[PDB]
Amino acid sequence: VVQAPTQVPGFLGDSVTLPCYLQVPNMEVTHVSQLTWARHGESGSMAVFHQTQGPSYSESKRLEFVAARLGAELRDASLRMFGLRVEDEGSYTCLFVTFPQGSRSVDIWLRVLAKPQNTAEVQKVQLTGEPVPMARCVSTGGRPPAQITWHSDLGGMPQTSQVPGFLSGTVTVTSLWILVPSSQVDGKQVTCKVEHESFEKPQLLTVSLTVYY
Amino acid sequence: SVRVMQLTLGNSTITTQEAANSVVAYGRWPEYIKDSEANPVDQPTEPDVAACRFYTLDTVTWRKESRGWWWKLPDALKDMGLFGQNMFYHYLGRAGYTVHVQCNASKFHQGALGVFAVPEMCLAGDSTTHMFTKYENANPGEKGGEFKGSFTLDTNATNPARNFCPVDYLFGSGVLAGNAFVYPHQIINLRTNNCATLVLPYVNSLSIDSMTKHNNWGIAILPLAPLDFATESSTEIPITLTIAPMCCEFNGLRNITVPRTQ
Amino acid sequence: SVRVMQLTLGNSTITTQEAANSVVAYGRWPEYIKDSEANPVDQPTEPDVAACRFYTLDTVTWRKESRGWWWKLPDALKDMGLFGQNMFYHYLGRAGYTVHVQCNASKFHQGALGVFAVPEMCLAGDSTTHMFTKYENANPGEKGGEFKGSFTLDTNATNPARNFCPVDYLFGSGVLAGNAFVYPHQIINLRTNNCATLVLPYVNSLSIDSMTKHNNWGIAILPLAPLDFATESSTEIPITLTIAPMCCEFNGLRNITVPRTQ
Amino acid sequence: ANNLPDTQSSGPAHSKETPALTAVETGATNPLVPSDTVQTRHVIQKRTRSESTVESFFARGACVAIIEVDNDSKLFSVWKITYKDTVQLRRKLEFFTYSRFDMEFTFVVTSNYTDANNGHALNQVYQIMYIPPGAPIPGKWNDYTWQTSSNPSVFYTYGAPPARISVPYVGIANAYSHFYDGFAKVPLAGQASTEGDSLYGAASLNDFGSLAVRVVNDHNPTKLTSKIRVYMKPKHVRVWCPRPPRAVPYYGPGVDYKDGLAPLPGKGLTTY
Numbered sequence A: 001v002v003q004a005p006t007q008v009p010g011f012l013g014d015s016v017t018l019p020c021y022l023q024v025p026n027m028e029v030t031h032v033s034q035l036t037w038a039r040h041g042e043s044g045s046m047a048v049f050h051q052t053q054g055p056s057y058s059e060s061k062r063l064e065f066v067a068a069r070l071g072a073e074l075r076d077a078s079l080r081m082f083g084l085r086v087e088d089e090g091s092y093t094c095l096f097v098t099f100p101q102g103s104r105s106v107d108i109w110l111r112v113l114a115k116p117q118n119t120a121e122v123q124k125v126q127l128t129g130e131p132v133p134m135a136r137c138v139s140t141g142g143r144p145p146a147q148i149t150w151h152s153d154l155g156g157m158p159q160t161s162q163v164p165g166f167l168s169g170t171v172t173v174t175s176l177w178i179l180v181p182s183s184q185v186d187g188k189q190v191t192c193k194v195e196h197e198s199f200e201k202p203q204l205l206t207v208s209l210t211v212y213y
Numbered sequence B, C: 001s002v003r004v005m006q007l008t009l010g011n012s013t014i015t016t017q018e019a020a021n022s023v024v025a026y027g028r029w030p031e032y033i034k035d036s037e038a039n040p041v042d043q044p045t046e047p048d049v050a051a052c053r054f055y056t057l058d059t060v061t062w063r064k065e066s067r068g069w070w071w072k073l074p075d076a077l078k079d080m081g082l083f084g085q086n087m088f089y090h091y092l093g094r095a096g097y098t099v100h101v102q103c104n105a106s107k108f109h110q111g112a113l114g115v116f117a118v119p120e121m122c123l124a125g126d127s128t129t130h131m132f133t134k135y136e137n138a139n140p141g142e143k144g145g146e147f148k149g150s151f152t153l154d155t156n157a158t159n160p161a162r163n164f165c166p167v168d169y170l171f172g173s174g175v176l177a178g179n180a181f182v183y184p185h186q187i188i189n190l191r192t193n194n195c196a197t198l199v200l201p202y203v204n205s206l207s208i209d210s211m212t213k214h215n216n217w218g219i220a221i222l223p224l225a226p227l228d229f230a231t232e233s234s235t236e237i238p239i240t241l242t243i244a245p246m247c248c249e250f251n252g253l254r255n256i257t258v259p260r261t262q
Numbered sequence D: 001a002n003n004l005p006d007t008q009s010s011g012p013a014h015s016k017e018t019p020a021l022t023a024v025e026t027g028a029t030n031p032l033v034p035s036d037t038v039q040t041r042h043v044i045q046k047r048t049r050s051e052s053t054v055e056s057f058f059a060r061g062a063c064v065a066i067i068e069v070d071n072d073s074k075l076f077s078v079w080k081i082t083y084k085d086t087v088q089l090r091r092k093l094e095f096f097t098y099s100r101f102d103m104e105f106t107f108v109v110t111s112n113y114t115d116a117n118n119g120h121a122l123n124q125v126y127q128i129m130y131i132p133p134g135a136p137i138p139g140k141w142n143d144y145t146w147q148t149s150s151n152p153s154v155f156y157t158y159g160a161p162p163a164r165i166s167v168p169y170v171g172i173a174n175a176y177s178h179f180y181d182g183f184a185k186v187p188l189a190g191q192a193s194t195e196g197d198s199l200y201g202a203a204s205l206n207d208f209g210s211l212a213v214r215v216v217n218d219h220n221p222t223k224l225t226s227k228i229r230v231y232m233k234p235k236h237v238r239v240w241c242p243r244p245p246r247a248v249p250y251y252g253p254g255v256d257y258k259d260g261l262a263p264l265p266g267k268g269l270t271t272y
């Protein structure tokens, strides 16, 4: 039976794998077990991972095939696409062949495009009233735009305007800044939470303030 | 030579000094209905020289950003002299055509235009409602239409446009444009020729039909290689279309047809 | 016409739309050894299509400052596919050639290249020691060599270069270059042609010889009128050389020859 | 459906004839063969194009409809005759603008109990009635229309080999139109917009009529469903004016598109 889990982000840069798992029940085991991959994709009719005995690269030069092949296993095979440009989607499929019924499988696809970088800058001098002190949360390089979120310590947060996306090489860039008004203290752990859902926990950057005179 | 020609029909003559031969669609020259293929029994009218002559439709301009143009026959000629009169006064009509596309530039310009003559050139619409394009939009007349770089669905439910949305690479009908070469065509590559000439016989599943309800041929012009010049990001060269109906014969005379417009 | 041609040898075809005819050296087309002129008694090998085909040697670039280039045959083809294999496996070898030099520019460029095919093209050395050029230097292979504007004597006694010093106006051999026109040639004058084509029969004082010890023909290319363009002091146009051996026959098969290099 | 020409041996060339050079602007394709650009040997050609003839290309029964009837108004169903309800045969036919042929229809009938442990019924007999445009359409699974005194009917007994009938070329034109760039009406100046409006690319509202299917047996309270799969094969085929095949998904009876507009995959320009 077909049990492919591949609905994968998929991280860009790159590079990451495009897996295909077909767990085999269980008393009516499967051969011949050649594995085909069809893209989705201006398919007329190839960008294919096919594997008869020796793994055959149907011409998309930017491919890596990692399965215990030339012998057999059978197929919980992993593919990899590098690289490194956003040759995106579209979609991809994973179809097997079988002596019993199984010259068949399922189409399964997902995401791609890319992660960002962040830094904080705070200025300038306070002549009020009553805008910026000013904390800026710059977000450079991420086509699927990173959801920048400025929060802090008090109800002096509702004030968060954005620089939208004037995209760099394939990749989108933004800058959230605050503003935050007036007056004195240093002094608070005002934290910008930049996400994108890659890496570990979202980019939490805490800073200070320019207090003058 | 393959490059110099003169076409004379009625009181009109066309000369060219940079042709690339001429194409006769499917190898068939236009002809009149034979008695063995005749259907309507009434005596036909054959205007001859009054209708079978060269009519120049409006000139379009080619720019680096152009996606393409299209026209429908006999539609584009419905207001052309006595051809249009006979078309509207008769229930049935039949005609072949000599399509002459004109486009001159210079030895420092580049670009290639694909000129295709398509029988039953059905185009794609703009809504989720199938075959929703309305008569007035499907028949633009001499001004014809244009191809687009992408499909954009009309969502105004209150006032649907009911128009075509011909995407260029999809040949305006859901097929790949690179395969449009299976239709009679010529290419106007600026470094080689001035024009394209196609002789089209009458094509249909009937010997004669209603010219107002049905368009037999479609003319599609697509920039295969975009227009470019010296260093002028700014470049415009006109494309003039001259068409002449051939072997016109009409049947079923009555009062004149006045179709609804806009 | 004199200007359009197509040459087909084996699996290779060359087309040209700006030729100036072709020269057949001494009016002799290459041929195989006749029984009446035969010498080695063993059965010859004749690779035919595997060796008699067009091989493209490295492209050189012509600049305002270029003095000229030279190659030696069969030397320049010693590493070319199955021709080179047969050359090294046999003691004796014989072949004719079709030399096709390629050089295109534009209508605003000037320059003329003299392409000469010289039988027994012996070149002058660089030292006071006579006939001192060493084998490795005399046989550069596909990269060939270059002409110089002046003679410069090698004085390093400890490590003599033992190389050639072909001065251009002296045709690299002590004769005036203007008289090199007594040898089969063509001229690639940029305002007239793209190429030069020469068919060379086998020339030697023997019917067959050692291809490794002896070079039968020499190809010399000299800028008769220097390269010049619009106002670009900076101008470079490539010169590609494509040669095809003809009527190859080898005698005296043994183990392969591996000559010393550099 | 015949032979291909032999390859003649071809030697070297050095001439003013250049078949390799051409000018595609003319609208013509360069008719070169291998011997025009390379040296060839003589090969006696034995391959033929017997299977790619227009006839052999279409000589297959393709499914065009799956009519369903529930013998417990569903006691009978009506299917408007068309080849556009499915995609496979439709795409093949659309390689051409016009066609003319005879048709062979084969009907594969299957049925089963909805309930694993309930009900029973005696062997079923089906009636497939063709209702030509104009004839009265059945309102009940048992009204007067099923008398078929003039309409052609096919009575199929469940379990018997698939039923099969032939239909002649029935078009009102000299050929079937796969594409019709026009309307059935011309809106006239002055009439209300509701007036003279018709579908683009549509001819008759009822081109070929429809099929009315029912089970003739008296229905039992048992839950049963039957499906009649209609297979059609064009025989004695003639086709005119080739067209490029459908590249994007079909979106209705027209040439309309909407969804799979990006059919081609990515591939490096210099990647083999």
Ligand SMILES: COc1ccc(OCc2ccc(COc3c(Cl)cccc3Cl)cc2)c(Cl)c1
Residues within 6 Å of the ligand: D064, D081, D082, D083, D093, D099, D103, D105, D128, D129, D130, D152, D153, D154, D165, D167, D170, D176, D177, D178, D208, D211, D232
């Ligand atoms: C261009 O491609 C075409 C053209 C016409 C077509 O249909 C025309 C058509 C007309 C009448 C009948 C009626 O046939 C039947 C009869 Cl008499 C009796 C019982 C059952 C049937 Cl089924 C069936 C098909 C089709 Cl399916 C494809």
